[PDB]
Amino acid sequence: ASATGLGGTDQKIDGDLKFDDTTGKYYAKVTVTGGTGKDGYYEVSVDKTNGEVTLAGGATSPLTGGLPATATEDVKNVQVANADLTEAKAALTAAGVTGTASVVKMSYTDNNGKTIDGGLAVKVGDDYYSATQNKDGSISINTTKYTADD
């Protein structure tokens, strides 16, 4: 729907999509006919809950500057904000419990005051599952394998 509303015959992005945390807004690429360098990623906002194309401020004219400098480097890195917690919610739904999830650290309140990281153990119930923070920050599900009666 966004591609159709933006105009043109086709606007689907080829290859991997580009996300940058500093920008905070999606990139839309529109092909240009009879020009070189005119095609560049523009900053757009997509609302998933709304489900329809809405234009804020009535800005029909494209952003000036010719080729935009904010979108010039291709990066293959894929990261999403911590508020998403897609894998955590999926694991919770697999367990069947939904609610506010709390993270803890393998520490002790004593004379020494220990502090050892316990990863992204952001769990709802008092039984705090151990979810492992990865090298790139990905939350990983470490569930021990057991052979049941089957």
Side-chain angles (χ1 to χ4, degrees), residues 74-137:
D74 53 319
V75 184
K76 302 100 182 179
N77 310 349
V78 191
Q79 189 69 250
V80 75
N82 213 4
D84 210 358
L85 294 174
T86 57
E87 185 161 2
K89 298 288 97 175
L92 262 58
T93 52
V97 54
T98 314
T100 305
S102 167
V103 65
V104 290
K105 303 305 173 176
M106 185 180 288
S107 306
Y108 279 159
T109 61
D110 208 2
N111 54 320
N112 312 79
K114 270 70 66 179
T115 305
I116 302 96
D117 180 71
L120 274 299
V122 192
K123 309 306 144 194
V124 177
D126 275 0
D127 62 357
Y128 281 152
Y129 169 73
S130 59
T132 298
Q133 176 201 355
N134 212 29
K135 37 187 301 180
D136 66 324

